[PDB]
Design a protein around this ligand. Structure first.
Ligand code: SF4
Ligand code: SF4
Ligand code: SF4
Lengths: 69, 148, 57, 184, 212, 111, 392, 161
């Protein structure tokens, strides 16, 4: 459903249970939930998200992502 | 010479658009924007290559596009017009402001003359464009410097 | 001769770092002309004093 | 004993005697130094000073963004469907963010972007370095066309044999560009 | 609102009246600071070699009056020559507070202005030294030429002469202290001063040397 | 040890200050906003960052007392002072010797 | 306040560290005059270089790489462009290969000269520190002519070869430089071998055996100064370095005096490789290469796949092919390797820089065992460290 | 099987240490998969064989949510060689429980290199002396260079505004 190149937002409930929560901090930064990250290079079940903050991009699951219209 | 008075402030009220010729090792230009700042004139030292079109920067608002750096959209930051935003914050009990442009020697003559004819059409505002170099710091109006 | 913005000139004076380099001029001004030299990898334009630039056909 | 301190002192007090002589002979040589604001040293033919810009040449294709290491140059363009050709409306390279690697002047088809020779850009404000398209299109400052600077040349530009740029009355580079066109 | 990040109107009149005598003493006050200011021998990344090439013989450091000091107290100028990460970010403020108040930090290189090439995607780089300490003169370049640093010294020297002797009060820090009590668990420090004499380097532990 | 979080506008130390000399404590955190006078404050917004400083200290009072966690509090205060500039509550100081505009330039709202 | 106790005193070298080899922090503890332990705190220049490359194309990452070993410069660009050109099988022309040997041997001279100046001031005499940097300024202008920058940020190495050919008065200007610098190499050697006060600070001070050097992991003039004779330009047949005759400088002593004489002998052998490459150049000088381009421009022995600076000027959208890789380049400081594994897109999947100084700094606690306090910067100045390579 | 062995894989087969031999490299070295329980048995045989020099102990992520890899590119160093035999041992480890046994006692070059594998990636090395963070602050909590590392909203890490 989630294409390559549309604005997505991260859901907090499906993120802090899985394997993607071990790499990061538990206190999640607020730029994930403001829906502005452009998803590029979907690879199977996972997706790289270019968030508007000048930090490295993250790879999250496509189940952990909600489209921000 | 060495003991400088306040003739630099009186020449700026006369001409309105000066053109300093300072020593290129610096340190001797700024002693004349202290005599300028002692007489109530505030000072906005800007950089002459950093300005774009001086009409669209000084008296008009300009859309400054910041570095999106590949992780941001094309934002347009509309900054206020520089000489007429620093005039309104300047209180009316003090005198005007001066534009202390440094590295004026990379400005074209069309941008020299635009800074010359603006200081009289805009009240309580002057410019000092630091252009060129000389062994002794000296000034002249911008009206005949473009006539050189 | 006069210089229009886009003709191929080459430098003629010997007291200069760019002795005989040639290229397209760009953004002629009231006393100065910048000549894009087309040199190798990174194209470089250098200011001159509107003289010592003999063009070729 | 007493017959040793007149012989254990000579072995190095004459070595500093042959060391005070060589350091005094270091003062015999001319000071090879580039006094900056009165002798600015001439940059090379490939030096990446700062980027120039031609607003009448940039056809809005963002190759400069895709080859930049940080995707720095802001290309503001509309599509302009009445003419069916994209025409830009603003261009800016925020220097200070700009590493002067000049990938944009290399991968450009229309030869718009180009490196200048001026390194003398230093502002009091970080945002005064965000150059406009008409601020980048200004004419560079040449070291030779300044009546306060005696421009001394660089190494690999002197004639063959001399390794200094001060007592150089004339000359050129140590080779010829086209010497062999009527020879061979 | 009306204007984002506004400029506060200076309500003070700045009655900066002075005679011929006091400004003649202010010229000597500013000349003595612009003409013999001592930079700290500081350098982190690549811009320290371009700064150390200016110490040498081809470009003269001690020609404007610049003497490099390897101590924060004796130096006033600090040329931030190098990319500062999350580490060196508390260390550079500590080098900055241990200075007499005419400081005049100048940023050198692209990575002390906006964190230049690591401003796109880097998890530990502070983007610009002006997120930690106030900067007088900015200097782009990567790396700047040693001639280009001596312009930034010249641009700095023009800024010392603008400083006034009766405006010496804003050079000291203001102290708006606030206090809150927390309930965070204190942690023992990670980096204790033993490396070789730690009780894990002398021999491999059991339940791991059996399969060796 | 003096765990500290020193950005430009926020100096959070792990301890209390007795007349300049900072003494490292375990219970308290001291904060002085804007050591350099870059922003001209007022009585209203200085209490507004106290509605943010004591909020984040009470929120993060279940975590560890490290330099990483003091930096997380000192960052969110520095993101709160920048929100006070974009709301036009405080403004830039012009009596300061530097005018480098660390928290963005002045700009008008909606062109 | 400060008290006087009887336990061993721990001093912090501090991240300030007024030296020219980066920003270290040694928590070295003292036993009166002898050290007993020392932990190095690194990471003060960790800008996240490996995470950057996973969002960079190769032409977008070529400016990033000459900041790890910023004394060297193009030694970092050597490993970078060799990672997809040895994986995609892209042929490098023979002339562009010899320009790479010319540029890398000039970087190793500049790598060793930046090592030499601070090392001579740390071991004693401070007056050659100003005369060595003058000799490095000649190497700056040789790169400033050919590339557009002095010692780093010189995007010269490409995937299909090199960025551009040399300038006109360039090949005759090593013959002014590297025929003048080579008399001064023996002048730098006679500073420490003669005046026998410097040998009492370098004989046996920081000695490492041969068997411990291979186990702890060492490369370049720190491994070879224990009597190993391992050089990756000889071991790996790397880009027409095998077309020259040059001896590998070995010193079977292990001490810091052996590390001094090897690095001085690496300067001397580099000029040998330079002069064999300036005369062994395929088209010779560029002003004479371009001369044959006009007399026989249709189809000659010149204008081939060789005698030119690039094979094919590749697009910015050059996809790295799929496969693991590990390319090695013998730098001036050791083995600088990168472990490239890339997917079929333009970004590599993992870019693990294996630095030459990250693996040589882990021996510094073991070398500082029994050494004195005045011989701490004498050890650290002889590892030839650049922090930025260690921390990335 | 599907993929044949090589010169190092046939040596480990002759010592009753079954290893999942991968194919050749893109440069031409042997890639060998060893489980984390049989790592110290394999590397003790290769060190006695002659592989006295380990380089680039590289932790590598196979993708987000996949198994982490700790690679060991060990070469046979001699006094003078001409392309000596090398082999890369890759040890796959899951995201949860990322433990690989340390090879510091075999090769001392895996002290800081395994710290860099623990500083960036979450791979905890059992038996490793002084296993801490080198490249980062020691009180950092996240694991960068993983594909999943969400960088915190620090004021210093933002744009210059
Ligand atoms: S690289 Fe050249 S053609 Fe492409 S957008 Fe920039 S100026 Fe235009
Ligand atoms: S100089 Fe570098 S950063 Fe600047 S526009 Fe060119 S490629 Fe981009
Ligand atoms: S921009 Fe480049 S040269 Fe300047 S400090 Fe950063 S890494 Fe060094």
């Amino acid at each position: 459903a989630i294409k390559k190149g549309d604005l997505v937002k991260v859901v907090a409930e499906k993120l802090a249970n899985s394997l993607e929560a071990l790499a990061s901090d538990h206190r999640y930064p607020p730029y994930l939930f403001e829906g502005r990250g452009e998803v590029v290079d979907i690879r199977g079940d996972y997706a790289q998200i270019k968030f508007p903050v000048p930090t490295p991009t993250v790879w999250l699951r496509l189940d952990q992502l909600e489209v921000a219209q | 010479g060495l003991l400088a008075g306040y003739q630099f402030v009186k020449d700026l009220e006369s001409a309105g658009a000066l053109a300093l010729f300072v020593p290129p090792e610096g340190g001797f230009e700024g002693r004349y924007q202290r005599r300028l700042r002692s007489k109530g004139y505030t000072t906005l030292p800007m950089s002459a290559p950093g300005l774009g079109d001086l009409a669209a920067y000084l008296t008009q608002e300009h859309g400054i596009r910041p570095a999106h750096t590949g992780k941001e959209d094309i934002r347009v930051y509309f900054q206020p017009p520089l000489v007429t935003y620093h005039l309104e914050n300047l209180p009316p009990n003090a005198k005007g402001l001066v534009l202390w442009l440094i590295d004026g020697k990379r400005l074209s003559k069309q941008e020299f003359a635009y800074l010359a004819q603006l200081t009289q059409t805009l009240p309580k505002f002057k410019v000092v464009v630091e252009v060129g170099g000389d062994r002794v710091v000296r000034w002249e109006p911008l009206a005949d410097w473009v006539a050189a | 001769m006069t210089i229009l913005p886009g003709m191929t000139v080459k430098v003629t004076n010997p007291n200069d770092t760019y002795y005989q380099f040639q290229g397209i001029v760009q953004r002629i001004t009231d006393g100065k002309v910048a000549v894009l030299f087309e040199g190798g990898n990174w194209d470089k334009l250098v200011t001159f004093q509107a003289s010592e630039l003999e063009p070729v056909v | 004993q007493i017959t040793n301190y007149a012989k254990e002192a000579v072995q190095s007090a004459k070595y500093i005697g042959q060391g005070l002589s060589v350091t005094f002979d270091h003062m015999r040589r001319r000071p090879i130094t580039v006094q900056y604001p009165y002798e600015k040293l001439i940059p090379s033919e490939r030096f990446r000073g700062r980027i120039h810009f031609e607003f009448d040449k940039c056809i809005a294709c963002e190759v400069c963004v895709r080859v930049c290491p940080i995707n720095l140059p802001v290309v503001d363009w509309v599509f302009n469907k009445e003419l069916k050709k994209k025409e830009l409306k603003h261009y800016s390279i925020d220097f200070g963010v700009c590493i002067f690697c000049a990938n944009c002047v290399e991968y450009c088809p229309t030869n718009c972007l180009s490196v200048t020779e001026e390194y003398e850009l230093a502002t009091y404000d970080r945002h005064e370095l965000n150059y406009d398209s008409v601020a980048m299109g200004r004419i560079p400052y040449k070291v030779t066309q300044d009546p306060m600077v005696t421009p001394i040349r660089e190494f690999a530009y002197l004639p063959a044999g001399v390794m200094s740029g001060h007592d150089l009355p004339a000359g050129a580079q140590r080779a010829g560009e086209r010497p062999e066109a009527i020879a061979n | 609102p009306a204007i984002l990040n506004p400029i506060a109107r200076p309500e003070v009149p700045q009655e900066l009246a002075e005679n011929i005598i006091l400004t003649s003493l202010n010229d000597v006050y500013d000349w003595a600071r612009l003409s013999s200011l001592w930079p700290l021998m500081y350098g982190t990344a690549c811009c320290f070699i371009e700064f150390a090439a200016m110490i040498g013989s081809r470009f003269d450091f001690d020609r404007f009056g610049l003497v490099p000091r390897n101590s924060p107290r004796q130096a006033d100028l600090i040329i931030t020559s190098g990319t500062i990460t999350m580490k060196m970010a508390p260390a550079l403020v500590r080098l900055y507070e241990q200075m007499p108040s005419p400081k005049y930090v100048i940023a050198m290189g692209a990575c002390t202005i906006t964190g230049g090439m690591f401003s796109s995607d880097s998890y530990s780089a502070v983007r610009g030294v002006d997120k930690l300490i106030p900067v007088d003169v900015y200097l782009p370049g990567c790396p700047p030429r040693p001639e280009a640093i001596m312009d930034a010294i010249v641009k700095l020297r023009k800024k010392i002469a603008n400083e006034h002797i009766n405006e010496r009060g804003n050079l000291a820090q203001t102290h708006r202290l606030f206090t809150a009590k927390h309930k965070m668990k204190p942690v023992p420090p990670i980096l204790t001063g033993q490396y070789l004499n730690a009780p894990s380097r002398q021999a491999p532990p059991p339940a791991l040397a059996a399969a060796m | 040890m003096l765990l500290k979080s020193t950005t430009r506008h926020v100096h959070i130390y792990a301890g209390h200050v007795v007349d300049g000399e900072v003494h490292p404590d375990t219970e308290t955190l001291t904060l002085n906003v804007d050591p350099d006078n870059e922003l001209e404050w007022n009585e209203a917004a200085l209490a507004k960052v106290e509605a943010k400083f004591r909020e984040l200290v009470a929120n993060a009072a279940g975590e560890d007392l490290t330099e990483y966690n003091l930096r997380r509090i000192g960052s969110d205060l520095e993101h709160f002072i920048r929100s006070l500039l974009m709301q036009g509550e405080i403004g830039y100081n012009l009596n300061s010797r530097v005018r480098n505009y660390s928290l963005g330039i002045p700009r008008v709202n909606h062109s | 306040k400060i008290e006087t106790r009887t336990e061993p005193m721990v001093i912090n070298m501090g991240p300030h560290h007024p030296s020219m080899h980066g920003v270290l922090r040694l928590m070295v503890t003292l036993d009166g005059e002898d050290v007993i332990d020392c932990e190095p705190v690194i990471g003060y220049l960790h800008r996240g270089m490996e995470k950057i490359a996973e969002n960079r194309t190769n032409i977008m990452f070529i400016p990033y790489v000459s900041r790890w070993d910023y004394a060297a410069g193009m030694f970092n660009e050597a490993v970078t462009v060799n990672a997809p050109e040895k994986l995609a099988g892209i042929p490098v022309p023979k002339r562009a290969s010899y320009i790479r040997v010319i540029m890398l041997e000039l970087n190793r001279i500049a790598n060793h000269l930046l090592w030499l100046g601070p090392f001579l001031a740390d071991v004693g005499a401070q007056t050659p520190f100003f005369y060595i940097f003058r000799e490095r300024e000649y190497i700056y202008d040789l790169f400033e002519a050919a590339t557009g920058m002095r010692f780093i940020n010189n995007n010269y190495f490409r995937i299909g070869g090199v960025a551009a050919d040399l300038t006109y008065g360039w090949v005759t200007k090593c013959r002014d430089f590297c025929d003048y610098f080579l008399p001064k190499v023996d002048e730098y050697e006679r500073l420490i071998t003669n005046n026998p006060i410097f040998v009492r600070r370098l004989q046996g001070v920081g000695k490492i055996s041969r068997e411990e050097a291979i186990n702890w992991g060492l490369s370049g003039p720190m491994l070879r100064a224990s009597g190993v004779k391992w050089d990756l330009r000889k071991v790996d047949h790397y880009e027409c370095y095998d077309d020259f005759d040059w001896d590998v400088p070995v010193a079977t002593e292990g001490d810091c005096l052996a590390r001094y004489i090897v690095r001085i002998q690496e300067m001397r052998e580099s000029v040998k490789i330079i002069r064999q490459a300036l005369d062994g150049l395929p088209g010779g000088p560029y002003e004479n290469l371009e001369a044959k381009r006009m007399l026989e421009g249709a189809k000659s022995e010149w204008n081939g796949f060789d005698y030119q600076y690039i094979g094919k000027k590749l697009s910015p959208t050059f996809k790295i092919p799929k496969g693991e890789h590990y390319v090695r380049v013998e730098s001036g400081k050791g083995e600088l390797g990168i472990y490239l594994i890339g997917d079929d897109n333009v970004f590599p999947w993992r870019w693990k820089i294996r630095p030459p100084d990250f693996n040589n700094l882990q021996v510094l606690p073991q070398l500082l065992k029994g050494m004195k306090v005045a011989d701490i910067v004498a050890i650290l100045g002889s590892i030839d460290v650049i922090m930025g390579s260690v921390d990335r | 099987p599907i993929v044949e062995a090589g010169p190092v894989g046939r040596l480990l087969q002759s010592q009753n240490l079954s290893v999942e031999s991968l194919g050749r490299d893109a440069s031409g070295v042997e890639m060998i998969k060893v489980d984390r329980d049989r790592l110290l048995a394999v590397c003790q045989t290769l060190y006695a064989d002659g592989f006295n020099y380990l380089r680039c102990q590289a932790a590598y992520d196979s993708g987000p949510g996949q198994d982490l890899v700790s690679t060991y590119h060990l070469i046979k160093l001699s006094d003078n060689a001409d392309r000596p035999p090398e082999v890369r041992i890759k040890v796959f480890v899951p995201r949860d429980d990322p433990r690989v046994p340390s090879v510091y006692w075999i090769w001392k070059t895996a002290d800081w290199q395994e710290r860099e594998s623990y500083d960036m990636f979450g791979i905890v090395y059992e038996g490793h002396p002084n296993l801490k963070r080198i490249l980062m602050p020691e009180d950092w909590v996240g694991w960068p260079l993983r594909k999943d590392y969400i960088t915190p909203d620090f004021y210093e890490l933002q744009e210059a505004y």
